[PDB]
Amino acid sequence: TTDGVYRVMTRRLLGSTQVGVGVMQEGVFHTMWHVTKGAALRSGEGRLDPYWGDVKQDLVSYCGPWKLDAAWDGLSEVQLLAVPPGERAKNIQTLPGIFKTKDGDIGAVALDYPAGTSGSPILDKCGRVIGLYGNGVVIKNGSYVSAITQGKR
Amino acid sequence: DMYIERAGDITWEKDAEVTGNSPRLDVALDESGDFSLV
């Protein structure tokens, strides 16, 4: 199955519904846990079985261990490769904010998209995936900010 | 039952629109995977 960015679809609701987005790289499919809940996936005629997942990180990988290990450099602009339901993939460039936590700081992107955009990759200037979009907060003025959520390789 | 469909290459786009703020926020992450503002 080809490297790239993928829509995660279900037929269980009304019509065809996009519940999320993911990344195929090095033979492993990467998405957020709340998108699939760890359920298996179909890719054409083939089946993708969950391999690793963690609810607290809100991540899951299929067919193998988590492969994405690039990280935001804390300084440069990044691009969100947003794949909204029913709409063409689009790159949005932005300078990340920061989630400060008791266990360290991670990048965050203040961009709002439909729920089924969950799992869209965030990219550095070399095209490496530095994390996935869609686990975040709503701040005082009502705007959505997503963590740049990255796994461990 | 869920299935996947390719949507593109993972590639930096030279002429991308630039938008969005860079807020610095104190947050907490709970065992359920939910972020909250501290």
């Binding site: 439909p114 869609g134 686990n135 959505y144 | -």
Partner: peptide
């Protein structure tokens, strides 16, 4: 975050 809330 639409109807996803935080998600």
């Amino acid at each position: 975050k639409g109807g996803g809330x935080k998600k």
